[PDB]
Design a protein around this ligand. Structure first.
Ligand SMILES: Nc1nc2c(ncn2[C@@H]2O[C@H](COP(=O)(O)OP(=O)(O)OP(O)(O)=S)[C@@H](O)[C@H]2O)c(=O)[nH]1
Ligand SMILES: [Mg+2]
Ligand SMILES: [Mg+2]
Length: 174
């Protein structure tokens, strides 16, 4: 169920209790491998857990990994590239959507590369409410460190050459 270049896919974010958190209706696949999915979206519907719908106003590139517990949204804003990183389960794709579990913690990267770790308080409350196993807490804490090391190395989607290649590829196919 590797999505194909040019295919439009839904992206569904769940909580650990199986409830939907967030859904992006339309992302165009730019690359699809056994380990990595890269997509672009622009003016996609977005649905919240109360059913409310909003529309994205600017393009973004999304990056999904089958072996890391995070995913990344690269947002093209006027003053430059912001990243929003979800601590998550790795993804699985089927005919319905690309799917992941959202694990509360997130990392904002500003255009000059500085990062802020978000929702540590929301993580501790949700971990107790939904009873995350000890190994998940260890994996997520480790993947916070890995994600920060990737930002500091400008690796994977944090690479300027990654943005140059995939921003252009998405402008052309859209
Ligand atoms: N693809 C896309 N995603 C966007 C855009 N603007 C914001 N988002 C993403 O949509 C999601 C919801 O935005 P927002 O409500 O600001 O997040 P939040 O409050 O941090 O999210 P939460 O999961 O902790 S309840 C976030 O992942 C955010 O980065 C956009 O233009 N395009
Ligand atoms: Mg999140
Ligand atoms: Mg959060």
């Amino acid at each position: 169920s590797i999505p194909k270049e040019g295919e439009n896919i839904k992206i569904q974010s769940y909580k650990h209790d199986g409830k939907i958190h967030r859904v992006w209706s339309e992302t165009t696949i730019l690359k699809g491998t056994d380990h990595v999915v890269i997509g672009g979206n622009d003016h996609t519907l977005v649905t919240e857990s109360d059913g409310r719908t909003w529309i994205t106003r600017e393009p973004a590139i999304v990056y999904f990994h089958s072996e890391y517990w995070f995913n990344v949204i690269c947002m093209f804003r006027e003053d430059g590239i912001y990243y929003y990183c979800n601590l998550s389960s790795p993804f699985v794709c089927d005919e319905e959507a690309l799917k992941y579990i959202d694990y509360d913690l997130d990392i904002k990267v500003y255009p000059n590369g500085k990062y802020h770790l978000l929702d540590e308080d929301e993580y501790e409350q949700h971990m107790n409410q939904m009873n995350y196993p000890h190994d998940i807490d260890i994996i997520l804490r480790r993947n916070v460190d890995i994600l920060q090391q990737w930002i500091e190395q400008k690796k994977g989607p944090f690479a300027p050459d990654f943005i140059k290649v995939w921003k252009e590829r998405y402008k052309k196919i859209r």
